[PDB]
Amino acid sequence: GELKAIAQELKAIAKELKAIAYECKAIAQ
Amino acid sequence: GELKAIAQELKAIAKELKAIAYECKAIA
Amino acid sequence: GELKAIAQELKAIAKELKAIAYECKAIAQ
Amino acid sequence: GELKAIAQELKAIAKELKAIAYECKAIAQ
Amino acid sequence: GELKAIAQELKAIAKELKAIAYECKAIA
Amino acid sequence: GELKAIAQELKAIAKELKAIAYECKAI
């Protein structure tokens, strides 16, 4: 239902932020 | 209802973050 | 009510991230 | 109540993203 | 309960974004 | 349940943002 849909969109948000954090780390060294 | 509106806005947020992740990588 | 207020704040969050994405893309090219 | 507390924290999040978007714009000029 | 837990994580998120905004301003 | 799942994804989001904040400062 709708609460699961919210949780799934939040999981997608976490995945994009993890990619951004990865690239941050890479830039730093 | 409003729970669907919340999920739709979160989907929009995820798409914008995906774009940001791409561009940041391209700029770098 | 309160669920509508939450959706409205998420809409504001989405708009600010769209502004950031736009600038990122402008800078990139 | 807790739903109002959630909305308030989302308002704080939008404000910080607005600041970040501002700096992006400043960087672009 | 879980609604309080959600509000607390959102507070932590706002705090990290405040740090990012600060660092943004400083790096620039 | 589903509210716990939401809280857990939000915790993960806070973690990734803390990492971004940390690496930024280094840069």
CB within 8 Å: E14 and D17? no
- The resolution in Å comes to 1.9
CB within 8 Å: D20 and C23? no
Subunits next to E (3 or more Cβ pairs <8 Å) are D, F
Experimental method: X-ray
User: Within 13 A of B8's CA, how many CA atoms are on the CB side?
Assistant: 9
Rounded Cα distance between B17 and E3, Å, is 25
Give the best residue of B20, B24, B25, B27 to mutate against chain C (max C CB count within 10 A).
Answer: B20
CB within 8 Å: B4 and A9? no
Determine contact, residues F16/E19, Cβ cutoff 8 Å.
no
Note the Cα C29 to chain centre separation in Å: 21
C5 CA to chain D: closest CA distance, Å?
6
Rounded Cα distance between C22 and C16, Å, is 10
Q: Do chains C and F touch (3 or more CB pairs under 8 A)?
A: no
Rounded Cα distance between E24 and F5, Å, is 31
Determine contact, residues C29/D27, Cβ cutoff 8 Å.
no
Nearest CA in chain C to B18: C21
The residues, ordered by sequence, that sit 6+ positions from F6 with a Cβ below 8 Å of its Cβ are: A3, A6, A7, A10, E2, E6
Nearest CA in chain B to C12: B9
Q: How many CB atoms lie within 10 A of CB D23?
A: 20
